[PDB]
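request received
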Amino acid sequence: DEANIETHGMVPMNRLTDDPRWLPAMSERVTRMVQRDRNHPSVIIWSLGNESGHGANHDALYRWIKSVDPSRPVQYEGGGADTTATDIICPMYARVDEDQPFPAVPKWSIKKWLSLPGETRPLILCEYAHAMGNSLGGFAKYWQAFRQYPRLQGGFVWDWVDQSLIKYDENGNPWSAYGGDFGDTPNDRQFCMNGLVFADRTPH
Amino acid sequence: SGIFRDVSLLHKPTTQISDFHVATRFNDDFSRAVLEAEVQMCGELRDYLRVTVSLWQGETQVASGTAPFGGEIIDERGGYADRVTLRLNVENPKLWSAEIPNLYRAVVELHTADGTLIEAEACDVGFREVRIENGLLLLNGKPLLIRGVNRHEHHPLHGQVMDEQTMVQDILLMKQNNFNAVRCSHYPNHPLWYTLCDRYGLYVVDEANIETHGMVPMNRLTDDPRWLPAMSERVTRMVQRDRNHPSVIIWSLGNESGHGANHDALYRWIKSVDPSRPVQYEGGGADTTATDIICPMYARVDEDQPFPAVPKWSIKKWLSLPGETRPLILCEYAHAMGNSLGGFAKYWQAFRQYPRLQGGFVWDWVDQSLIKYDENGNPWSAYGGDFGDTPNDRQFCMNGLVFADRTPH
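response:
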């Protein structure tokens, strides 16, 4: 279950979340969420949101949860995926064997990530294996790691369905639209179609 | 078998220096060190005896301290009358390392209050700090990358007898080939070896003369208290002899003697008498309570070998096992028997990518082959079985990176 907080478009990503002024507003996002779903045996992990970098407000909110609901772990990827605001290491798109060394927010090979000095948490990918168009190449490299490393416990493929819409030709013939097909500017074209299945729920 | 090492006569004064330990402490940056020497005596104690300790830098004297016998109160009964600890301050010491084996000379003089010398002892000293912090084996503050090799004392004509020349040849070679460290497989070495590593610059691993491979299970003797006494002697006298060598940076409990309780006693002993170096043992699984380092032998880069009881996990896997925090340094890898060393690049590549993979020791330096003849007393390399010896493991005594004559494979 995940809080409705995403601030990807900011610079840095951490701009509103490291701001005390926004604390109350984020607060509501996490609290009302916890307040509403806490009795669901299916909910097993809580997430502070997505792509918001890492701010103090995350830290507080993590804590809040930990005290009100100690029956679930809490996870959050922002700020490098292994911050003090998460219980599970949960990178998005890290490679099985290849290190992606971004500055400040590197994405180590997942096997090496567990072994970093001091690290002891488990690793579950929050997003891996982008199924955009003709994809899933490598999948198996992953499922093998998951099986050989006790502390690599899975992940969540990105994602279920394509975010396509239905349009119509002059004959009123139906047809799947995408980024910009509405005059929507600016857009990100076909990037909304990353599903393992067509919007109709027909499989790739 | 036989009398393979030197034989000497030493003449000492009745009242003498009987032992002495050296130590070095630094501040957060190695800008200041404190050398701490503890000296012990034997013979008639007198109020006029003193001990002088001077530390030299070639022809230069850097620090000196004099004192009289008798130290701190350690227990309800007092302290040692026949001991003393001096403490010399050293500013901006030159650190010792395999890259730069900077050495100092310490002179320990026993004399009379009037200044009359009774006897002198001494040793090269090198300032370093070997420590394990946060999962890493550090040296003078930096995480080492061990480029080493295991090496026995072998000589084609001489047998087990060592000599400078051989010792030096081996040294120059390992260095020319970019080796950093060496492991004394699987026993303490010829005294001078340590001195040579101190000056040339090489990381040593002092190993105790204990291997009980042929036992079934391997445990048999080392888990038997009746054997504790006999094993203890091999650990303790070892540490008592080589402990002041800057080059020794790790102690090892010996080899392939499974995992017994004696092993734990022994690991604790060292940990107590010499908190300065880490301790390793590989037996019983390589990641036992008797070792400060995960030190497997022949564990693969990415493939597990799950033997029952003593599996060899893939080295990348081992690090992350649930709860595992130790650094990993292979005590034996890349078995160079004959036409071998295939897949080497694979380790090095892991070594350089995982912070906690810090090296290993190739097995091994030289071929244990002997020389033989025939007609014209013309020599020829001999192996297992070649002497009528039964049983034997034939060529399995040949696994070095160099031929017994020090020519390269």
